[PDB]
């Protein structure tokens, strides 16, 4: 038993870190098959990055002005194109080490792990969520641009995030692997400012059972609720509604303890409306948003890849 | 910047998981070379655990008694011997992804990765401690042991844990690759008592180090103190002492920031004395000491491996 925040197995991912040099700009790509991936912006030099015209950038730009790298393995760029907000480059020898692989827009409060990379190369590994405002809180530094997120199922690799920017709050932005930004972000070093942020409701009911399910019980009461009058309290303090979509996703954890999804939201609204009092969860203070129901039910039954 | 619990990738270590069943039980080995490393209780029946004659039990074992899978193709057991706590289980073949590694005995109060694996496949990565008790807060069911922690120095992996054991406290037991418990722990079935824990003084001074490096500076005090009026405050909240050792492997930290190692003493004695009245470092409600001064700046300054 115990509970801990663990990332996927990184090596199926590993294999597929490239560095990507154009101009003086290095940051890392995503090689699978024949195409490497990267954000666009390894085409700007600093004083474009205002304001950059992306279009007029990339026409300057010639397959040889791309330095591709995987290790010391140089790769041959015979082709270059924009899409959304992601250069692809088309190179001459296909990923040998390309694992089965998705590329997929995930949905706010879904969680993924994260490869921080520098120059190609992977530093480390972390799970992430989705925010309901489309930003992650990550640790990413200079050069860490191009890093993906992921998921894996037995053996498919699902990308969901590469790494763009970090906005003035600290927090962080990218796109799905079609190059679309999550949230309303765009690829310019302006101001621009997440949206309010909120508590994924659904990912701290399931915090909860993991709790329980762990032997930390302290918090159960002899109360229920309603939806409607849960919602209430939730609107209050900054929670997602909690909807029967959610309640249903919560029925394997409600089946394997016992505890009915509405007498979790009591205990959740209790928590809410008297705080802690000094006692933790699982070794926490603060009430826990990072864990999926699917997260809590792997780490609780013991799946494998 | 920001700042989370980060694992080391652990692509070089999957390629090295294979399955080890002798009779019923089935468990996780290390397959380095041509020798499989795996906990002795794998030789044990549900009966045997409550106290375990393991020579005895060893020498009703034969080589084809031992079974192992690296994925799907089976390695020929030719030799077995046990080394204190671990069996080695010579196989005819060398492993073809095995890493440049050594074997480590890390010293309390540092920290390593630890890839969970069920069946000989891996299922997830997280960051642990060795706690001043030798044991590790980790996430372990059914299965696990034979899991490894490690630590990555560029292309060699320092391989210093093996799981064994869940102690009464839901807090996890093992050796490192010799075969050596960390702890006073023996692998029998009967109660036993882990020590009283105490909060690892080092790695919390370098985590506010992190907190500065990446903008919560509100702990930052006016007042200063000495080593020896830290330690009586610490030794009254069960803190480790800080002696001029730690002061010195906390220079890198406190050079970049401009604090001095007994200025951060002084905000950590008016976080103790004083809590943190409903605010957070970092994101956490607690003071976090499962961050080493190693594992600070790797972060904040980008290592790859
Ligand atoms: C990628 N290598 C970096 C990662 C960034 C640096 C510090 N922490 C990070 O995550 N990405 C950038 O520097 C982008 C590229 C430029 C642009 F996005 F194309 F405009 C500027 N970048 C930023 O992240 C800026 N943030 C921003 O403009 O928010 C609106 C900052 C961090 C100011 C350079
Ligand atoms: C290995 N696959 C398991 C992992 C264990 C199961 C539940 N959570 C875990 O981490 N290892 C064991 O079951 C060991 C093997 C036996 C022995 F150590 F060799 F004696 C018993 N084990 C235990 O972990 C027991 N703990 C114990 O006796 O500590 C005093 C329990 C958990 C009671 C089976």
Redesign the interface.
Known sequence: ???????????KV??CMVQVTCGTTTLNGLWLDDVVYCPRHVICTSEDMLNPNYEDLLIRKSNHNFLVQAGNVQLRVIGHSMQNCVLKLKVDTANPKTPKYKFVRIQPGQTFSV?????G??????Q?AMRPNFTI????????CGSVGFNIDYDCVSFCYMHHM?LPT???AGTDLEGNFYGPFVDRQTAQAAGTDTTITVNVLAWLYAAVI??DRWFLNRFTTTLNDFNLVAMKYNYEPLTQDHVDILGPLSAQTGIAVLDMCASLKELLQNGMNGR?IL????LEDEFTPFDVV????????
Do not use: D, I
């Open positions: 038993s115990g509970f801990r925040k663990m990332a996927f197995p990184s090596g590993e294999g490869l921080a990379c520098y120059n190369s992977p530093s480390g590994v972390y992430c809180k990550g640790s990413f530094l200079n050069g860490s970090e600290g927090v962080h762990n032997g933790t070794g926490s203070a603060l792997r780490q609780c039954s013991g799946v494998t890849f």
